[PDB]
Design a binder for this molecule. Structure first.
Ligand code: CA
Ligand code: CA
Ligand code: CA
Ligand code: CA
Lengths: 145, 149, 49
Protein backbone atom coordinates (compact mmCIF):
# COMPACT_ATOMS: atom_id res chain seq x y z
CA UNK A 1 0.00 0.00 0.00
CA UNK A 2 2.91 2.36 0.65
CA UNK A 3 4.29 1.66 -2.84
CA UNK A 4 0.88 2.46 -4.35
CA UNK A 5 0.95 5.74 -2.41
CA UNK A 6 4.21 6.41 -4.29
CA UNK A 7 2.48 5.96 -7.69
CA UNK A 8 3.85 2.58 -8.72
CA UNK A 9 2.40 0.35 -11.42
CA UNK A 10 1.27 -3.23 -10.90
CA UNK A 11 4.64 -4.51 -12.13
CA UNK A 12 6.64 -2.35 -9.72
CA UNK A 13 4.74 -3.58 -6.66
CA UNK A 14 5.06 -7.22 -7.74
CA UNK A 15 8.85 -7.03 -8.05
CA UNK A 16 8.95 -5.10 -4.77
CA UNK A 17 7.04 -7.94 -3.12
CA UNK A 18 9.28 -10.53 -4.78
CA UNK A 19 12.38 -9.07 -3.12
CA UNK A 20 10.53 -8.56 0.19
CA UNK A 21 8.91 -11.98 0.68
CA UNK A 22 10.78 -12.43 3.98
CA UNK A 23 9.00 -9.51 5.69
CA UNK A 24 5.76 -11.47 6.17
CA UNK A 25 4.84 -11.81 9.81
CA UNK A 26 5.84 -14.73 12.01
CA UNK A 27 3.17 -16.55 14.02
CA UNK A 28 5.47 -16.99 17.02
CA UNK A 29 6.19 -13.27 17.31
CA UNK A 30 2.55 -12.18 17.41
CA UNK A 31 -0.27 -13.45 19.65
CA UNK A 32 -2.92 -12.20 17.23
CA UNK A 33 -1.56 -14.30 14.37
CA UNK A 34 -1.65 -17.42 16.57
CA UNK A 35 -5.43 -17.82 16.45
CA UNK A 36 -5.89 -16.17 13.05
CA UNK A 37 -3.54 -18.66 11.39
CA UNK A 38 -5.24 -21.56 13.17
CA UNK A 39 -8.62 -20.28 11.99
CA UNK A 40 -7.23 -19.60 8.50
CA UNK A 41 -5.78 -23.10 8.13
CA UNK A 42 -9.07 -24.72 9.16
CA UNK A 43 -10.85 -23.86 5.91
CA UNK A 44 -11.68 -26.88 3.72
CA UNK A 45 -9.94 -25.70 0.56
CA UNK A 46 -6.66 -24.51 2.08
CA UNK A 47 -3.67 -26.33 0.59
CA UNK A 48 -0.10 -25.59 1.67
CA UNK A 49 0.94 -25.83 -1.99
CA UNK A 50 -1.04 -22.64 -2.68
CA UNK A 51 1.58 -20.64 -0.74
CA UNK A 52 3.90 -20.33 -3.72
CA UNK A 53 6.06 -17.20 -4.02
CA UNK A 54 4.16 -16.20 -7.16
CA UNK A 55 0.73 -16.95 -5.69
CA UNK A 56 1.48 -14.87 -2.58
CA UNK A 57 2.62 -11.77 -4.48
CA UNK A 58 -0.35 -11.91 -6.87
CA UNK A 59 -3.01 -11.91 -4.16
CA UNK A 60 -1.22 -9.33 -2.00
CA UNK A 61 -0.79 -6.98 -4.96
CA UNK A 62 -4.44 -7.33 -6.02
CA UNK A 63 -5.80 -6.76 -2.51
CA UNK A 64 -3.40 -3.90 -1.72
CA UNK A 65 -4.41 -2.01 -4.86
CA UNK A 66 -8.08 -2.39 -3.92
CA UNK A 67 -7.39 -1.41 -0.31
CA UNK A 68 -5.28 1.60 -1.31
CA UNK A 69 -7.84 3.04 -3.72
CA UNK A 70 -10.69 2.25 -1.31
CA UNK A 71 -9.35 4.57 1.39
CA UNK A 72 -8.71 7.26 -1.23
CA UNK A 73 -12.51 7.24 -1.69
CA UNK A 74 -13.84 6.99 1.87
CA UNK A 75 -11.18 9.47 3.06
CA UNK A 76 -10.71 11.82 0.09
CA UNK A 77 -8.01 13.74 2.06
CA UNK A 78 -8.72 16.72 -0.22
CA UNK A 79 -9.35 18.82 2.88
CA UNK A 80 -6.74 21.35 4.06
CA UNK A 81 -6.18 22.13 0.36
CA UNK A 82 -9.18 24.44 -0.24
CA UNK A 83 -10.85 24.95 3.14
CA UNK A 84 -13.55 27.57 3.67
CA UNK A 85 -11.30 30.51 2.89
CA UNK A 86 -13.39 33.69 2.32
CA UNK A 87 -10.64 35.06 0.07
CA UNK A 88 -12.34 38.46 -0.06
CA UNK A 89 -15.98 37.55 -0.69
CA UNK A 90 -17.62 38.34 2.66
CA UNK A 91 -16.79 42.04 2.24
CA UNK A 92 -16.13 42.28 -1.53
CA UNK A 93 -19.10 40.25 -2.80
CA UNK A 94 -20.85 43.54 -3.57
CA UNK A 95 -17.95 44.56 -5.82
CA UNK A 96 -17.92 41.41 -7.96
CA UNK A 97 -21.70 41.70 -8.34
CA UNK A 98 -21.24 45.37 -9.27
CA UNK A 99 -18.62 44.39 -11.88
CA UNK A 100 -21.16 42.42 -13.94
CA UNK A 101 -23.61 45.35 -13.84
CA UNK A 102 -21.10 48.14 -14.52
CA UNK A 103 -22.43 50.70 -16.97
CA UNK A 104 -20.61 50.75 -20.34
CA UNK A 105 -19.14 54.05 -21.47
CA UNK A 106 -21.49 54.44 -24.45
CA UNK A 107 -24.52 54.50 -22.13
CA UNK A 108 -23.25 57.51 -20.17
CA UNK A 109 -24.53 61.02 -20.90
CA UNK A 110 -22.25 63.12 -23.07
CA UNK A 111 -21.47 65.71 -20.39
CA UNK A 112 -20.51 63.04 -17.85
CA UNK A 113 -18.28 61.29 -20.39
CA UNK A 114 -16.61 64.58 -21.33
CA UNK A 115 -15.77 65.27 -17.69
CA UNK A 116 -14.20 61.82 -17.41
CA UNK A 117 -12.28 62.45 -20.64
CA UNK A 118 -10.78 65.68 -19.30
CA UNK A 119 -9.52 63.96 -16.15
CA UNK A 120 -8.07 61.08 -18.18
CA UNK A 121 -6.55 63.35 -20.82
CA UNK A 122 -4.70 65.61 -18.39
CA UNK A 123 -3.26 62.71 -16.38
CA UNK A 124 -2.13 60.65 -19.39
CA UNK A 125 -1.28 63.32 -21.98
CA UNK A 126 -0.75 66.71 -20.30
CA UNK A 127 0.96 65.61 -17.09
CA UNK A 128 3.13 63.11 -18.98
CA UNK A 129 4.22 65.84 -21.40
CA UNK A 130 7.79 67.04 -20.81
CA UNK A 131 8.57 70.72 -21.36
CA UNK A 132 11.95 71.99 -20.14
CA UNK A 133 11.87 75.79 -19.96
CA UNK A 134 13.75 76.52 -16.72
CA UNK A 135 17.16 76.70 -18.39
CA UNK A 136 15.86 78.92 -21.19
CA UNK A 137 13.97 81.21 -18.80
CA UNK A 138 16.91 81.71 -16.43
CA UNK A 139 19.22 82.40 -19.38
CA UNK A 140 16.85 85.05 -20.75
CA UNK A 141 16.49 86.79 -17.38
CA UNK A 142 20.27 86.80 -16.77
CA UNK A 143 21.05 89.00 -19.80
CA UNK A 144 21.61 92.75 -19.55
CA UNK A 145 19.87 94.46 -22.44
CA UNK B 1 -25.20 59.16 0.35
CA UNK B 2 -27.66 60.69 -2.11
CA UNK B 3 -25.29 60.19 -5.05
CA UNK B 4 -25.05 56.47 -4.27
CA UNK B 5 -28.80 56.04 -3.79
CA UNK B 6 -30.06 58.48 -6.44
CA UNK B 7 -29.05 59.17 -10.03
CA UNK B 8 -29.25 62.46 -11.91
CA UNK B 9 -32.53 61.40 -13.53
CA UNK B 10 -34.09 60.45 -10.19
CA UNK B 11 -33.07 63.78 -8.64
CA UNK B 12 -34.69 65.59 -11.57
CA UNK B 13 -37.86 63.52 -11.17
CA UNK B 14 -37.99 64.20 -7.42
CA UNK B 15 -37.54 67.93 -8.02
CA UNK B 16 -40.49 67.89 -10.41
CA UNK B 17 -42.50 66.02 -7.78
CA UNK B 18 -41.43 68.56 -5.15
CA UNK B 19 -42.45 71.42 -7.44
CA UNK B 20 -45.81 69.68 -7.93
CA UNK B 21 -46.39 69.92 -4.17
CA UNK B 22 -44.96 73.46 -3.99
CA UNK B 23 -47.36 75.38 -6.20
CA UNK B 24 -46.17 78.67 -4.69
CA UNK B 25 -42.53 78.04 -5.59
CA UNK B 26 -41.17 79.46 -2.33
CA UNK B 27 -39.27 76.21 -1.74
CA UNK B 28 -41.25 74.90 1.25
CA UNK B 29 -44.20 72.53 1.63
CA UNK B 30 -46.94 73.72 3.98
CA UNK B 31 -49.85 71.72 5.41
CA UNK B 32 -52.34 73.25 2.96
CA UNK B 33 -50.02 72.48 0.04
CA UNK B 34 -49.66 68.89 1.25
CA UNK B 35 -53.39 68.67 1.92
CA UNK B 36 -54.29 69.95 -1.54
CA UNK B 37 -52.49 67.16 -3.41
CA UNK B 38 -53.99 64.54 -1.09
CA UNK B 39 -57.48 65.74 -2.02
CA UNK B 40 -56.53 65.47 -5.70
CA UNK B 41 -55.62 61.83 -5.03
CA UNK B 42 -58.94 61.21 -3.23
CA UNK B 43 -57.90 61.19 0.43
CA UNK B 44 -59.45 63.75 2.79
CA UNK B 45 -57.24 63.79 5.89
CA UNK B 46 -57.47 66.12 8.87
CA UNK B 47 -54.87 68.65 9.98
CA UNK B 48 -54.00 66.50 13.01
CA UNK B 49 -52.57 63.68 10.89
CA UNK B 50 -51.50 66.15 8.20
CA UNK B 51 -49.09 67.78 10.65
CA UNK B 52 -47.91 64.36 11.85
CA UNK B 53 -46.96 63.23 8.35
CA UNK B 54 -44.95 66.46 8.04
CA UNK B 55 -43.18 66.22 11.40
CA UNK B 56 -42.19 62.63 10.57
CA UNK B 57 -39.76 63.91 7.91
CA UNK B 58 -39.26 67.52 9.00
CA UNK B 59 -35.70 67.57 10.34
CA UNK B 60 -35.16 71.16 11.50
CA UNK B 61 -38.65 71.38 13.01
CA UNK B 62 -39.59 74.61 11.21
CA UNK B 63 -42.96 73.08 10.30
CA UNK B 64 -42.32 73.12 6.54
CA UNK B 65 -40.76 70.63 4.13
CA UNK B 66 -38.02 71.89 1.82
CA UNK B 67 -36.25 70.07 -0.99
CA UNK B 68 -33.27 68.83 1.11
CA UNK B 69 -35.70 67.11 3.48
CA UNK B 70 -37.80 65.84 0.57
CA UNK B 71 -34.73 64.26 -1.05
CA UNK B 72 -33.68 62.73 2.28
CA UNK B 73 -37.09 61.06 2.54
CA UNK B 74 -36.82 59.58 -0.95
CA UNK B 75 -33.21 58.52 -0.36
CA UNK B 76 -34.29 56.38 2.60
CA UNK B 77 -37.19 54.90 0.61
CA UNK B 78 -34.82 53.75 -2.15
CA UNK B 79 -32.27 52.41 0.35
CA UNK B 80 -34.54 50.41 2.66
CA UNK B 81 -36.23 48.44 -0.15
CA UNK B 82 -33.31 45.99 -0.11
CA UNK B 83 -32.51 44.60 3.35
CA UNK B 84 -30.98 41.13 2.95
CA UNK B 85 -31.73 40.28 -0.71
CA UNK B 86 -28.11 41.08 -1.64
CA UNK B 87 -27.43 37.33 -1.79
CA UNK B 88 -30.00 37.02 -4.60
CA UNK B 89 -27.92 39.17 -6.96
CA UNK B 90 -24.77 37.32 -5.87
CA UNK B 91 -26.48 34.04 -6.77
CA UNK B 92 -27.47 35.38 -10.20
CA UNK B 93 -23.88 36.43 -10.93
CA UNK B 94 -22.86 32.77 -10.67
CA UNK B 95 -26.16 31.72 -12.31
CA UNK B 96 -25.74 32.99 -15.87
CA UNK B 97 -28.49 30.96 -17.56
CA UNK B 98 -31.25 32.00 -15.16
CA UNK B 99 -32.42 28.74 -13.58
CA UNK B 100 -32.24 27.74 -9.90
CA UNK B 101 -28.93 25.83 -10.01
CA UNK B 102 -25.26 26.78 -10.35
CA UNK B 103 -23.46 24.59 -12.86
CA UNK B 104 -19.74 23.88 -13.00
CA UNK B 105 -19.53 25.56 -16.41
CA UNK B 106 -21.35 28.58 -14.98
CA UNK B 107 -18.89 28.56 -12.08
CA UNK B 108 -16.15 28.43 -14.71
CA UNK B 109 -17.67 31.44 -16.49
CA UNK B 110 -17.57 33.68 -13.41
CA UNK B 111 -14.14 32.38 -12.38
CA UNK B 112 -12.92 33.12 -15.91
CA UNK B 113 -14.13 36.72 -15.58
CA UNK B 114 -12.44 37.06 -12.19
CA UNK B 115 -8.69 37.37 -11.70
CA UNK B 116 -8.02 33.92 -10.27
CA UNK B 117 -7.87 31.01 -12.71
CA UNK B 118 -8.72 27.33 -12.25
CA UNK B 119 -7.08 24.30 -13.88
CA UNK B 120 -10.48 22.74 -14.80
CA UNK B 121 -10.15 20.24 -11.92
CA UNK B 122 -10.35 22.19 -8.65
CA UNK B 123 -13.63 23.63 -9.95
CA UNK B 124 -15.13 20.28 -8.95
CA UNK B 125 -13.60 20.56 -5.47
CA UNK B 126 -15.61 23.53 -4.20
CA UNK B 127 -18.80 22.76 -6.14
CA UNK B 128 -19.13 19.37 -4.42
CA UNK B 129 -18.53 21.10 -1.09
CA UNK B 130 -21.37 23.57 -1.70
CA UNK B 131 -23.63 20.99 -3.38
CA UNK B 132 -24.76 18.70 -0.57
CA UNK B 133 -27.28 16.77 -2.69
CA UNK B 134 -24.49 15.52 -4.95
CA UNK B 135 -26.30 16.29 -8.21
CA UNK B 136 -23.39 18.40 -9.48
CA UNK B 137 -25.28 21.71 -9.25
CA UNK B 138 -25.54 24.18 -6.36
CA UNK B 139 -29.07 25.50 -5.96
CA UNK B 140 -30.16 28.70 -4.23
CA UNK B 141 -30.97 26.89 -0.98
CA UNK B 142 -27.51 25.31 -0.84
CA UNK B 143 -25.84 28.64 -1.65
CA UNK B 144 -27.34 30.68 1.19
CA UNK B 145 -26.70 28.10 3.91
CA UNK B 146 -22.99 27.88 3.00
CA UNK B 147 -21.14 29.76 0.25
CA UNK B 148 -18.02 28.27 -1.33
CA UNK B 149 -18.78 28.05 -5.06
CA UNK C 1 -12.26 32.60 -29.79
CA UNK C 2 -12.09 31.05 -26.35
CA UNK C 3 -11.75 31.82 -22.62
CA UNK C 4 -9.58 34.85 -23.34
CA UNK C 5 -12.84 36.65 -24.24
CA UNK C 6 -12.65 37.86 -20.64
CA UNK C 7 -9.57 39.89 -21.62
CA UNK C 8 -11.49 41.54 -24.46
CA UNK C 9 -14.60 42.15 -22.32
CA UNK C 10 -12.42 43.34 -19.43
CA UNK C 11 -13.20 46.87 -20.64
CA UNK C 12 -16.96 46.40 -20.23
CA UNK C 13 -16.53 44.95 -16.71
CA UNK C 14 -14.66 48.04 -15.48
CA UNK C 15 -15.84 51.43 -14.22
CA UNK C 16 -16.44 54.03 -16.94
CA UNK C 17 -13.55 56.16 -15.69
CA UNK C 18 -11.25 53.14 -16.04
CA UNK C 19 -12.72 52.36 -19.46
CA UNK C 20 -11.78 55.78 -20.82
CA UNK C 21 -8.37 55.58 -19.14
CA UNK C 22 -7.58 52.46 -21.16
CA UNK C 23 -8.86 53.97 -24.41
CA UNK C 24 -6.56 57.00 -24.15
CA UNK C 25 -3.49 54.93 -23.23
CA UNK C 26 -1.78 55.06 -26.61
CA UNK C 27 0.61 58.01 -26.27
CA UNK C 28 3.99 56.37 -25.58
CA UNK C 29 3.75 53.91 -28.53
CA UNK C 30 4.63 51.13 -26.07
CA UNK C 31 0.93 50.70 -25.19
CA UNK C 32 -0.61 50.15 -28.64
CA UNK C 33 -1.70 46.60 -27.69
CA UNK C 34 -4.04 47.10 -24.73
CA UNK C 35 -5.79 50.03 -26.44
CA UNK C 36 -8.54 48.66 -28.75
CA UNK C 37 -9.14 51.91 -30.65
CA UNK C 38 -8.69 51.96 -34.44
CA UNK C 39 -5.77 53.95 -35.78
CA UNK C 40 -8.02 56.58 -37.39
CA UNK C 41 -9.59 57.48 -34.03
CA UNK C 42 -6.14 57.51 -32.41
CA UNK C 43 -4.90 60.01 -35.00
CA UNK C 44 -7.58 62.57 -34.14
CA UNK C 45 -6.44 62.80 -30.51
CA UNK C 46 -2.79 62.99 -31.55
CA UNK C 47 -3.62 65.72 -34.07
CA UNK C 48 -5.36 67.71 -31.34
CA UNK C 49 -2.52 67.06 -28.90
CA1 CA D 1 -45.06 76.73 -0.58
CA1 CA E 1 -37.83 72.13 7.14
CA1 CA F 1 -27.68 27.67 -13.89
CA1 CA G 1 -27.87 20.42 -5.50
Amino acid sequence: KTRYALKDTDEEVREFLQNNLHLQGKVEGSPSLRWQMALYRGLPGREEDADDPEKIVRRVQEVSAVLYHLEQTEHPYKSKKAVWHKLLSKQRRRAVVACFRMTPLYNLPTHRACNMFLESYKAAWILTEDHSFEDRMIDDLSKAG
Amino acid sequence: HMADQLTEEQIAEFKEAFSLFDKDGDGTITTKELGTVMRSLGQNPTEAELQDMINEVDADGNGTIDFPEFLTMMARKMKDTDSEEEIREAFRVFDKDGNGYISAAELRHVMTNLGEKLTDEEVDEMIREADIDGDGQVNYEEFVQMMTA
Amino acid sequence: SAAETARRTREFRSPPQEQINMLLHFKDEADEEDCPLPEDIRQDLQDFH
